[PDB]
Design a protein around this ligand. Structure first.
Ligand SMILES: NC(=O)c1ccc[n+]([C@@H]2O[C@H](COP(=O)([O-])OP(=O)(O)OC[C@H]3O[C@@H](n4cnc5c(N)ncnc54)[C@H](O)[C@@H]3O)[C@@H](O)[C@H]2O)c1
Ligand SMILES: NC(=O)c1ccc[n+]([C@@H]2O[C@H](COP(=O)([O-])OP(=O)(O)OC[C@H]3O[C@@H](n4cnc5c(N)ncnc54)[C@H](O)[C@@H]3O)[C@@H](O)[C@H]2O)c1
Ligand SMILES: NC(=O)c1ccc[n+]([C@@H]2O[C@H](COP(=O)([O-])OP(=O)(O)OC[C@H]3O[C@@H](n4cnc5c(N)ncnc54)[C@H](O)[C@@H]3O)[C@@H](O)[C@H]2O)c1
Ligand SMILES: NC(=O)c1ccc[n+]([C@@H]2O[C@H](COP(=O)([O-])OP(=O)(O)OC[C@H]3O[C@@H](n4cnc5c(N)ncnc54)[C@H](O)[C@@H]3O)[C@@H](O)[C@H]2O)c1
Ligand SMILES: O=C(O)c1nonc1O
Ligand SMILES: O=C(O)c1nonc1O
Ligand SMILES: O=C(O)c1nonc1O
Ligand SMILES: O=C(O)c1nonc1O
Lengths: 315, 315, 315, 315
């Protein structure tokens, strides 16, 4: 009333799962946009039939035309490369995507600025904390209207792994991973809870040990790499994380979700994007929540931001 | 496969909303049992038509026959009185329901023992922490197969009121209320989080004050009384809370939910039921979680348990 | 984005279930408006806590102030009486509500016209086919922006009863009941299908007989009366039916649903509202579907419309 | 209670979407089984994190070990090839998969017979009407416990395409495609309805023409081929169709769904599987519904069955 229009700029692995999930949730009409010919139209057609099974009413169309951005309510950018040519799976590193994806963000930004300057933008393309700011600069959208995917996805892993050990509902585990979405992501041990209870209580009771948690932290940081070596650059959980973010905006849920956002003094940082809990509602980023990090946590935060800053200089 | 059978022992205000919600969620076949003639059959018929609108397939039948408990997978007991004769709305107090409801629990217990000794039992009838133990004693069911409603409902209020001030998704507020479901319920300030973050951070930032929280605590404790004076003994939120509990069992969700359960040393208490976080899954109460309360919190816990113990002696 | 505002004009039995269902489905903010003091505020408070259990974010407020209609996206009118003074349950007849409810519709219409002339209106108050036109005349809203509840509720019953005999998913039974919501409702045997198959195939196969169907027709027509005599004027299924209608509008589902709507030549009738399949989407009544009734079916349709016309003359 | 175990025999494109959808719907624990090393473990890990975003509690594990079939409640077989070596996309034809997939079905059948003879089996591998019977013969399961995917998927397309022209909710279009899932699929014009109304009424009203319908029929038959040429062998809608079938079984929904099933005299055919509406509930295929086809429709049905019979002789 009228349905939201959601344009998926990039119709690859993540784009595909996102279109499926949007139809499942009847969230809005979908455009699968890509530079590749024919492919988005085929995925769109396939996906469109699921309206019947899903009891939904969302158009799904493929596109190779940038002007289809006009009318967009939400734009999700996954366009770009997943690996650098010449690198082995073992050497996969998000940083190496920088020179491959930077020009793509600039190009998409110009099209967003012209066609849908009032759209809410979610950036996924890596290295995401660099790409999101690049897209902000070139699209001209307000700071409350653009975020990057990171924390929802990283914490989904941490939360899940802990829930498996403790035999509780995965959603009942809460956790914060901040700073940047990459190898220096900051896993905040102090901010983990289980059913709202400090994880330390479960550690005291020998239900999960400090050593076990350390292994889970390492597993979390290395999850993307693990999946890349077993199969491919992850796409199912990324897609679900993105749609959770988009849905909070579309339905004014006001969920607290960790995303990459413009910092203006939080954690002592300005002029850069970094991962922190934000509240997402109808007005976009409605609140930026600054964790009251201790000195040691801040030092880790600084190390994460330093990586983003280093690559921004290279971009 | 085969559908669960859920018997609602008591088909009054809460029974009615529970049957509606069960059909909405397609959770299982429903029996609305009551001592009142005709009424449960009418509510059952009305509710049964919603299968069409809900895309569900749950039978809803009315009953005046205790043997319909046979085959029950889940039994929810709301049977009893909501107010004591002669009391004004202003003087409403759960304790006064004790002499009115005790015999009803004993009678229902015998029927459960005979007909569905393997059913999972949820007790709602007040005073609930007393009634749940009474029903445990008379039904003979295992300690992991019977709980009382309290904490999910009490915290729903605390969580909601805080979410309204902070402008966040209500589910993103987590909170613990323990001990007993009554005027001595223990509201644990230290165990409140918002998006997994300690509420104290929001207090430090002047987003919500200590005084505001105190008023919200008082409002929470007095919510039932407030609604009784405006309208009636609450039933919509109680129903939703109960169904959240029942659903966790039925679908093996392993949610952490605060319920009245048999204590065997937790908090220094045994031989009595009290409200504490538990994990509910296919095996019933799969874990009893003992909060590592400080000395002052424990003193409040003791005061709550003392009320249950006092009335148990009167029952 | 921004959330829809749904004003429930009338906060009685149907109003209450509607508020519960709106929160379950996170459809929009809710105002429970009534002339009765205190009651709507109590129901609103009770219902509001279910946001936690439902993972929703809908405000629920009570009101005694007509100006709260301002900003309404959807207005659902249930205000009025359910029985006439002096009538026994056995003599319950919707027609007798005419003199009791007519003035209420006129009053509400004026408030709608002043405060929310662009709102989509659903009329429930009986006799509904008369009341809906009355409200149309006094609210001044466009013909595509006001409908009356009838067919979704009447067919829910017919569909359900058949599904019980045939042991199929209730939603897989489709059926049409047209003309008016009252004792002359037209049950169109020819337009019944099961899994899209003509019911006649199942009759040919002796899975359900003509006599059985006749009994189901009588049961359907008399369902309200049956429930009134067992318990109360039905409210759970009415509520669900209404919310299915409101949801189709809000989410632009374009569902085909039988509702009371302004006829402009369909079935040979103009200047009156009658029950017929319509398509409900973001533009309100997007299509009025005229069944190609045979001569005998039309005669039944005419008899139904004649009752509406008779009472319109009495109103 | 306890959760269902769903084993996906084949973890390729359809397997992946099915695992995603199972977690979204919290339907049961999932095993992604494949002969390919590492791949299923990576997809399983990726998918498992979505439990957090989905509020679900389903294990997702990868496997290369046939014995993981033990304990299966539902087995979905997609194992096999999607195209024949040497064929161009333009020449794609399901029949050419026969010699590639027959041995795979025999092998899987033996493992099912040994490990989970009581599981409900859904066969997807093409040519499906041949493969499903092959799997029936080798698994030894009862006729009511094995079906093949076809009609739900084929009609999803027909229903959707019509809904796009008529501007109605796609689920409100009902349609039957029977016989076999291949180029001779039988599209039954007479059994199409829109909101339960015969499509002929909409044709009479010039809302959709006979010529338009003919083009939609051709488009439906050729949809797989169209998508193969634009992108790949379809997987999103197939997955959704399969999960709709599996869910009806798991939750005892009793939905009427067109699937390939053992014929024992229906349509004049025995000793072969063919597509027809069936009712799926807790007892598996609870009813086989025989459409009362006219002579001309039957001739088309016979042509479809003849293709299955021809390839069965070649298998
Ligand atoms: N932020 C995160 O947490 C996170 C998580 C996973 C993935 N990633 C990143 O997301 C990106 C997408 O991953 P994927 O798995 O979907 O990759 P993919 O290769 O399957 O899809 C990317 C698509 O982008 C398309 N593309 C290239 N240029 C384009 C342009 N100008 N406009 C539109 N489309 C264009 C490609 O043709 C391709 O189809 C990668 O950069 C990956 O590193 C980020
Ligand atoms: N634990 C909690 O958090 C909580 C919350 C709200 C309500 N309550 C309590 O729940 C109970 C029910 O509340 P309600 O609003 O549904 O009240 P209600 O009066 O609407 O319904 C109670 C029903 O119990 C029936 N009944 C009496 N004896 C019975 C028997 N032997 N077997 C079956 N039914 C019998 C009555 O006829 C009545 O229909 C009350 O005791 C109330 O105090 C507890
Ligand atoms: N169309 C249908 O299929 C259908 C189905 C069921 C009910 N009904 C009708 O719906 C109406 C409501 O039924 P219910 O069960 O909710 O009855 P109810 O008596 O529980 O509630 C009606 C409410 O309207 C209120 N009211 C009276 N005047 C008002 C005004 N000016 N503004 C706001 N509120 C006002 C009353 O105080 C009461 O709370 C009845 O007329 C009934 O016959 C119609
Ligand atoms: N019935 C239908 O309506 C319908 C619809 C679409 C697809 N299909 C068929 O479904 C099948 C699967 O399609 P897809 O898109 O998922 O193909 P896919 O190639 O992506 O996946 C098939 C998987 O089967 C695996 N496999 C091979 N032998 C195996 C074995 N012995 N055990 C377990 N796994 C084995 C392969 O390694 C591969 O991962 C194809 O035959 C296709 O024609 C049928
Ligand atoms: O973390 C991930 O899943 C990821 N996968 O590819 N790029 C990423 O950032
Ligand atoms: O807390 C409540 O809602 C309540 N209402 O009636 N009894 C109770 O315990
Ligand atoms: O049909 C009904 O349910 C009904 N109940 O009260 N009035 C009505 O129209
Ligand atoms: O119909 C289909 O989608 C299909 N795709 O690949 N094989 C099939 O049968």
């Amino acid at each position: 009333a009228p349905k939201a229009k959601i344009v998926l700029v990039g119709s690859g692995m993540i784009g595909g799962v996102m279109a499926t999930l949007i139809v499942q949730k009847n969230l809005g009409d979908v455009v699968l946009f890509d530079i590749v010919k024919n492919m988005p139209h085929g995925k769109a057609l396939d996906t469109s039939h699921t309206n019947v099974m899903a009891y939904s009413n969302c158009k799904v169309s493929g596109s190779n035309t940038y002007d289809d951005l006009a009318g967009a309510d939400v734009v999700i950018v996954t366009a770009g490369f997943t690996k650098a040519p010449g690198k082995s799976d073992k050497e996969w590193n998000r940083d190496d995507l920088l020179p491959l994806n930077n020009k793509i963000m600039i190009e998409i930004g110009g099209h967003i600025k012209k066609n849908c300057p009032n759209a809410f933008i979610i950036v996924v393309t890596n290295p995401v904390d660099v790409m999101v700011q690049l897209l902000h600069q070139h699209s001209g959208v307000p700071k409350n209207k653009i975020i990057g995917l990171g924390g929802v996805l990283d914490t989904s892993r941490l939360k899940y792994y802990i829930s498996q050990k403790l035999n509780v509902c995965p959603r009942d585990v809460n956790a914060h991973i901040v700073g940047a979405h990459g190898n220096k992501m900051v896993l905040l041990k102090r901010y983990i809870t289980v059913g709202g209870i400090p994880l330390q209580e479960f550690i005291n009771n020998k239900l999960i040990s400090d050593a076990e948690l350390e292994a889970i932290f390492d597993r979390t940081v290395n999850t993307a790499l693990e999946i890349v070596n077993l199969h491919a650059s992850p796409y199912v959980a990324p897609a679900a994380a993105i749609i959770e973010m988009a849905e909070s905006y579309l339905k004014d849920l006001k969920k607290v979700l960790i995303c990459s956002t413009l910092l203006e003094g939080q954690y002592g940082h300005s002029d850069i994007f970094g991962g922190t809990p934000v509240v997402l509602g109808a007005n976009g980023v409605e609140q930026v929540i600054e964790l009251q990090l201790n000195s040691e946590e801040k030092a880790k935060f600084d190390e994460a931001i330093a990586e983003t800053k280093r690559m921004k200089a290279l971009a």
